[PDB]
Amino acid sequence: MITVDITVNDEGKVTDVIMDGHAGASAVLFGSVNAIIGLTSERPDINYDDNGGHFHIRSVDTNNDEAQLILQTMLVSLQTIEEEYNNIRLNYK
Amino acid sequence: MITVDITVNDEGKVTDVIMDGAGASAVLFGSVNAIIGLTSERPDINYDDNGGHFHIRSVDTNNDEAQLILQTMLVSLQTIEEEYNNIRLNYK
């Protein structure tokens, strides 16, 4: 099972997303990180263990509307996978 | 085995995304749900043979939010293709 921990601050901004246990879920997450970097000015703080586990996206500019839209898109896409394969568990922190 | 045809107009807007045939499908369906759930854009969708053919046609090409989601979808598909060059992207 893949676990996705999602942290939304008091201002409604996605500050952290951590995926662990990681085809659909991985493509959505990695693709979204590449989109934030390639399409916006936001450069998230990315950390992961030596095995590629505990993949943590930490937002730097939480007021970047474009990066926030991409993160929300990533979450809607992960919720779409979860709805069909409830394999993946989304946890809202 | 999967082909994705992408049409970008003269104004740089994604007008059509046509997939014919797990990662690719999740990115496509998830992105459509995001456009519908997060923006005012309501794309024209043609869907046949339970995923065998899936065509997204933009209606409001000037919707910056829907356009960002489509570009995100394309970056995500390019990421899959870079790892499984299984999927072929074509710019029409």
CSV table of C-alpha atoms in Angstrom, one decimal, chain A residues 6-89:
chain,number,residue,atom,x,y,z
A,6,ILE,CA,-1.1,15.8,3.0
A,7,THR,CA,-0.6,19.0,5.1
A,8,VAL,CA,-2.8,22.0,4.4
A,9,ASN,CA,-2.1,25.1,6.5
A,10,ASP,CA,-4.6,27.5,8.1
A,11,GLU,CA,-4.5,29.7,5.0
A,12,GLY,CA,-5.6,26.7,2.9
A,13,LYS,CA,-2.2,26.2,1.2
A,14,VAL,CA,-0.7,22.8,0.5
A,15,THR,CA,2.6,22.9,2.5
A,16,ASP,CA,3.7,19.3,2.5
A,17,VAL,CA,3.0,16.1,0.7
A,18,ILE,CA,4.8,12.9,1.7
A,19,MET,CA,4.5,9.7,-0.4
A,20,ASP,CA,5.8,6.3,0.9
A,21,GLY,CA,5.5,2.7,-0.3
A,22,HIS,CA,5.8,3.6,-4.0
A,23,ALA,CA,2.5,3.1,-11.5
A,24,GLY,CA,-0.4,5.6,-11.5
A,25,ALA,CA,0.4,7.2,-8.1
A,26,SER,CA,4.1,7.5,-8.9
A,27,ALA,CA,3.5,9.1,-12.4
A,28,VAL,CA,1.1,11.6,-10.9
A,29,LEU,CA,3.5,12.6,-8.1
A,30,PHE,CA,6.8,12.8,-10.1
A,31,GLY,CA,5.0,14.4,-13.0
A,32,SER,CA,3.5,17.1,-10.8
A,33,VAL,CA,6.9,17.9,-9.2
A,34,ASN,CA,8.4,18.2,-12.8
A,35,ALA,CA,5.5,20.5,-13.7
A,36,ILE,CA,6.0,22.8,-10.7
A,37,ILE,CA,9.7,23.1,-11.6
A,38,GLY,CA,9.2,23.5,-15.3
A,39,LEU,CA,6.0,25.7,-15.4
A,40,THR,CA,6.3,27.9,-12.4
A,41,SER,CA,8.9,30.0,-10.4
A,42,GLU,CA,8.4,27.7,-7.3
A,43,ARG,CA,11.3,25.5,-6.3
A,44,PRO,CA,9.9,23.1,-3.6
A,45,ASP,CA,12.2,21.6,-1.0
A,46,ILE,CA,12.4,17.9,-2.0
A,47,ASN,CA,13.7,15.1,0.4
A,48,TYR,CA,13.6,11.3,0.2
A,49,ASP,CA,15.5,8.4,1.9
A,50,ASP,CA,18.4,6.5,0.2
A,51,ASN,CA,15.9,3.9,-1.2
A,52,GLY,CA,13.8,6.7,-2.7
A,53,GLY,CA,11.1,6.2,0.0
A,54,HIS,CA,9.4,9.0,2.2
A,55,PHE,CA,9.3,11.3,-0.8
A,56,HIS,CA,8.6,14.7,0.7
A,57,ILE,CA,7.6,17.8,-1.2
A,58,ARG,CA,7.7,20.9,1.0
A,59,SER,CA,6.3,24.1,-0.5
A,60,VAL,CA,8.6,27.1,-0.3
A,61,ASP,CA,6.4,29.9,-1.8
A,62,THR,CA,3.0,28.9,-0.5
A,63,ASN,CA,1.6,32.1,-2.2
A,64,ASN,CA,2.5,30.8,-5.7
A,65,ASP,CA,-1.0,30.3,-7.1
A,66,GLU,CA,0.3,28.3,-10.1
A,67,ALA,CA,2.3,25.8,-7.9
A,68,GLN,CA,-0.7,25.6,-5.5
A,69,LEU,CA,-3.0,24.8,-8.5
A,70,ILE,CA,-0.6,22.0,-9.6
A,71,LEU,CA,-0.5,20.6,-6.0
A,72,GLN,CA,-4.3,20.6,-5.9
A,73,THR,CA,-4.4,19.0,-9.3
A,74,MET,CA,-2.0,16.3,-8.1
A,75,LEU,CA,-4.3,15.7,-5.0
A,76,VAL,CA,-7.5,15.5,-7.2
A,77,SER,CA,-5.6,13.0,-9.4
A,78,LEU,CA,-4.5,10.9,-6.4
A,79,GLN,CA,-8.1,11.0,-5.0
A,80,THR,CA,-9.2,9.7,-8.4
A,81,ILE,CA,-6.8,6.7,-8.1
A,82,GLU,CA,-7.9,6.1,-4.4
A,83,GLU,CA,-11.6,6.1,-5.3
A,84,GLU,CA,-10.9,3.1,-7.7
A,85,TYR,CA,-8.1,1.4,-5.6
A,86,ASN,CA,-8.9,2.0,-1.9
A,87,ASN,CA,-3.7,0.0,-2.7
A,88,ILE,CA,-3.4,3.8,-1.8
A,89,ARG,CA,-4.5,5.8,1.3
